[PDB]
């Protein structure tokens, strides 16, 4: 048993009726002094280390050649000038086991935390020494954390893509289905999660060019995609993860849901394919009034109207579809479908729930397209256009497939540094750089949408950690007040930075002129409502920091009208799974699942108290399962009103909660404006 593992295990040994939280500092100190400093390759000078890394196929010479070695040395000086110390053993362990650069035999350590941060900053700045130093200060202060792909792979020769979330539209054709399988395998090969919209595919028992009842439906494509993701398993390193989305009004919705039942047949069940259900307001209205609903065969609708069923507004088109004799449908019970959804989420956590009209009532790019589905993590909500992949000899009609770049603000560190504006703008610049430098050669729609939309996702994390370390309960109205003010400021400065980038480059995103940013409809609630804190305690948290006012929002609206907006999408709150340990932060804006995290690595068990947990703030670190999910919905809806994309919203349920309770949580989320629901986690 390692000495640091023993020291970390002494946290649970209760001395004087309290956990020994101070043992984790001893644990991390022992871990470093006994393992990391021993296994860290040291070089006489930074020049020798850099030469070894570039020449041994560890780094990329292209981005490092943009600086004189003096500038790189000063950047590394800035990283090491902070004397950053990992507060807990788990932070250092996670970094040096997941993100630190190791030798080709994975025996020694080439990169410390400062080296990784310096390389990421030098890649972000793209030749600017002052910008690189600013990125170094931002990341070594741990105010901004680039996503796991960006943080892990930036500046590495043998790297995967810096983007890991992709959203593909699948057209109703064998050519398009085969192309979707190919692109899914190509993107999973790069290490990215792939989400596929299956709503355009015609249901089971539909006609294929005069041969009726010949289509296997969305479940055959689901099996194809599941095997494609199983094959493209990231070189046998990490299991290939993909998601499939289907509209709740699709005829195959029940077959779609039956793929996740525990009793599912092996010719129906899918293993590596997550499922998400898209629910328009029409379905919730039908279930509310207990009227019997209809699911429609998409190809009949396409033949009758020339438009896909998911391309049309179900609120206005549902009655026309039902009254159309040439549109094929079967009766369903919407309440029974809702209960089936809740039962499936209780049993397996699936499907994801995307409230279509909650997303699109505040969507800023409805002119480009409505948001029809989400990503594998249920936070990316962007307009997509389906591609028409024709025969081999013909020319394909390339659409827009969603792929956004992820980054997370550390709410605790941004708040303690009083640097919401600077951190938000620098994170926007880094995400923009990642977007520009991303070129995917086997997903033409993804590449086209990356070049045109220039969409980024700037998330946040350590919300519960910041609140509990400041004596604020997560469910308290003061917590929602802080979330309101903080994310209003984040949205303000992200919009300002996007407009500044548009002014600097003289270009906006494609089809910006039709957006609500161009017409000013986006800024209505910001030029009409004041989002300053309503509590003196919360207003004191923002001391020394200018909270944007209504006049500031009017000035921003005028600036955006004059100069445009560079990013179609800017903010999305991803789960931030493994980077939260490195940042000593609670995951995303979700509340903590456990106060102290018990995990086993190898044959030794490890203990991870939540960051900042102590005796004084023990009960402010309320576990998510002990919380009222209605108040968590209230918090996420408070945040969601300032996030243009969605938020990964996990439901934390007790074992005593019934199907009716899960349905009530889902319906209250729909009522409160929640866009997506990620997971149903039961204790």
């Amino acid at each position: 048993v390692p000495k640091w593992i023993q020291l970390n295990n002494e946290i649970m040994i209760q001395k004087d009726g309290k956990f020994q939280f101070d043992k984790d500092k001893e644990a991390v100190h022992s871990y470093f002094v006994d393992y990391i400093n021993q296994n860290t390759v040291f070089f006489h000078n930074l020049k020798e280390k850099l030469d070894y890394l570039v020449e041994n196929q560890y780094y990329e010479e292209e981005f490092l050649s943009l600086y004189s070695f003096e500038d790189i040395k000063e950047v590394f000086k800035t990283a090491y000038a902070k004397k950053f110390r990992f507060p807990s053993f788990m932070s250092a362990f996670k970094f040096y086991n997941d993100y630190a650069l190791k030798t080709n035999d994975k025996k020694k350590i080439l990169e410390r935390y400062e080296d990784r941060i310096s390389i990421v900053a030098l890649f972000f700045a793209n030749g600017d020494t002052e910008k690189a130093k600013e990125y170094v200060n931002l990341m070594i202060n741990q105010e901004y954390q680039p996503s796991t792909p960006t943080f892990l792979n930036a500046g590495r020769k043998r790297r995967g893509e810096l983007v890991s979330c992709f959203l593909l539209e699948v057209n109703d054709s064998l050519n398009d289905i085969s192309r979707a399988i190919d692109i899914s395998m190509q993107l999973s090969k790069l290490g990215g999660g792939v989400s596929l919209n299956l709503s355009k595919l015609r249901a089971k028992g539909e006609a294929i060019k005069d041969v009726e009842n010949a289509t296997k439906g969305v479940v055959g494509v689901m099996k194809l995609l599941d095997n494609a993701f199983r094959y493209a398993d990231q070189m046998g390193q990490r299991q290939g993860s993909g998601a499939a989305y289907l509209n709740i009004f699709h005829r195959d919705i029940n077959d779609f849901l039956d793929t996740k039942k525990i009793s599912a047949d092996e010719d129906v069940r899918v293993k590596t394919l997550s499922i998400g259900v898209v629910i328009p307001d029409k379905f919730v209205e039908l279930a509310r009034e207990d009227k019997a609903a209809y699911v429609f065969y998409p190809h009949t609708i396409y033949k009758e109207y020339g438009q896909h069923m998911d391309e049309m507004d179900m609120n206005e088109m549902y009655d026309k579809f039902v009254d159309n004799p040439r549109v094929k449908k079967e009766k369903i019970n919407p309440r029974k479908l809702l209960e089936k959804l809740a039962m499936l989420r209780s049993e397996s956590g699936y499907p994801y729930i995307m409230f279509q009209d909650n997303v699109n009532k505040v969507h800023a790019n409805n002119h480009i397209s409505k948001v029809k589905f989400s990503n594998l993590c249920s936070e990316v909500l962007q307009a997509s256009q389906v591609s028409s992949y024709t025969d081999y000899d013909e020319e394909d009609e390339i659409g827009l497939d969603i792929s956004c770049n992820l980054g997370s603000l550390n709410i605790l560190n941004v708040m303690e540094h009083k640097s919401i504006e600077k951190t938000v703008k620098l994170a926007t610049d880094s995400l923009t750089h990642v977007s520009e430098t991303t070129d995917i050669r086997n997903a033409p729609a993804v590449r086209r949408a990356n070049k045109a939309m220039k969409s980024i996702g700037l998330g946040a994390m350590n919300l519960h950690g910041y609140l509990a370390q400041n004596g604020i309960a997560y469910e308290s109205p003061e917590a929602r007040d802080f979330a309101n003010t903080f994310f209003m400021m984040v949205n303000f400065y992200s919009i300002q930075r996007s407009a500044e980038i548009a002014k600097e480059k003289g270009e906006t995103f494609d089809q910006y002129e039709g957006s609500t940013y161009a017409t000013g409809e986006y800024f209505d609630k910001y030029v009409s409502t004041d989002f300053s804190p309503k509590y003196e305690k919360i207003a004191n948290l923002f001391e020394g920091m200018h909270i944007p006012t209504t006049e500031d929002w009017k000035k921003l609206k005028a600036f955006v009208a004059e100069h445009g907006m560079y990013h179609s999408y800017r903010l999305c709150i991803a789960p931030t799974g493994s980077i939260s340990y490195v940042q000593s932060s609670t995951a995303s804006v979700m509340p903590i699942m456990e106060r102290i995290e018990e995990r086993t690595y190898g044959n030794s068990k490890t203990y991870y108290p939540m960051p900042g947990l102590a005796s004084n703030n023990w009960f402010f670190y309320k576990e998510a399962y002990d919380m009222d999910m209605f108040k968590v919905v209230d918090m996420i809806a408070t945040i969601q009103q300032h996030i243009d994309q969605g938020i990964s919203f996990t439901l934390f349920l007790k074992d005593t909660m019934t199907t009716r309770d899960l349905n009530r949580i889902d319906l209250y989320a729909h009522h409160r404006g929640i866009k997506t629901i990620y997971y149903a986690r039961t204790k």
């Binding site: 309440r335 005593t656 319906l667």
Partner: protein
């Protein structure tokens, strides 16, 4: 959470003795020394005798006391494999390699052998002590069963695997490998049934059941060391066999959800080469807030 999965794995592993032709083993058997032939015969008889107890008593007694139709079916399938497949397979190997008189003498010897008898009777004693509606006595018998399936057989399996890894007695070695593969899954399955009982107990009762399991393991292990020297010293293998016993003891403990008892050791490379919360309807007013 597990019975249907084990059902599937069990039935898809179904096999019959007739599938492997045994006669070609005589082409390597004739080249072994007397000590090698003697050890092989004695090991084989040891495995045969222990497996008969498992078929006649061990599996059927556990199937009798375990509640659940699906568990009883899996357990019945395992009992069938012991009696209908494994027992016939051991008999076939014997009849191929030795004449009738030699088989009778080896079984007479192994039947009187102190170390084989000690372990055979210890296991059988625990099966005979199961009481109706007493889950503690059932658990103790399950521990005994897991120790037989996942541990006690392996001092014996060593030798056929040792030959199999060298290209000797390949037909009987293939049979033994199929048998061993069945015993492995039997041990894992019975282990899960034991953990189910263990997890229903208080903390004091758990500590008491752990002490029982470790004490039993110790008694069996010390007898295995003696059994091992008695059979394998004459062919110079006892040191390596002892490492294999401890490695398999650790697997047996892990099957019972317990920590390994012995330090990790490397194994002889020749032997290695051989080897639903509650559905409630929405009653309206849940759509209004």
């Amino acid at each position: 959470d597990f019975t249907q999965m084990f059902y599937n794995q069990n039935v898809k592993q179904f096999w019959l003795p007739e599938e492997i032709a045994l006669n070609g083993d005589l082409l390597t058997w004739k080249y072994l020394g007397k000590n090698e032939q003697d050890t092989y015969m004695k090991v084989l008889a040891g495995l045969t005798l222990l497996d008969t107890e498992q078929g006649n008593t061990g599996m059927p007694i556990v199937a009798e006391h375990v509640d659940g139709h699906q568990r009883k079916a899996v357990l019945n399938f395992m009992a069938m494999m012991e009696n209908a497949v494994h027992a016939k397979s051991y008999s076939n190997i014997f009849m191929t390699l030795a004449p009738t008189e030699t088989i009778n003498e080896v079984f007479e010897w192994v039947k009187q052998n102190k170390y084989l008898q000690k372990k055979a009777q210890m296991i059988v004693g625990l099966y005979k002590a199961i009481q109706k509606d007493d889950e503690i006595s059932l658990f103790k018998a399950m521990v005994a069963s897991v120790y037989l399936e996942s541990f006690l057989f392996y001092s014996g399996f060593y030798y056929p695997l040792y030959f199999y890894g060298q290209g000797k007695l390949m037909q009987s070695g293939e049979i033994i490998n199929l048998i061993l593969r069945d015993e492995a899954i039997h041990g894992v399955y019975v282990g899960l049934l034991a953990q189910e009982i263990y997890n229903k107990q208080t903390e004091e009762k758990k500590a008491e059941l752990r002490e029982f399991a470790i004490d039993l393991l110790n008694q069996l292990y010390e007898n295995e060391l003696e059994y091992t020297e008695d059979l394998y010293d004459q062919v110079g293998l006892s040191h390596d066999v002892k490492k294999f016993i401890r490695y398999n003891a650790n697997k047996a403990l892990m099957n019972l959800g317990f920590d390994p008892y012995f330090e990790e050791e490397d194994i002889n490379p020749i032997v290695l080469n051989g080897l639903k919360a509650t559905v409630e309807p929405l009653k309206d007013d849940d759509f209004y807030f």
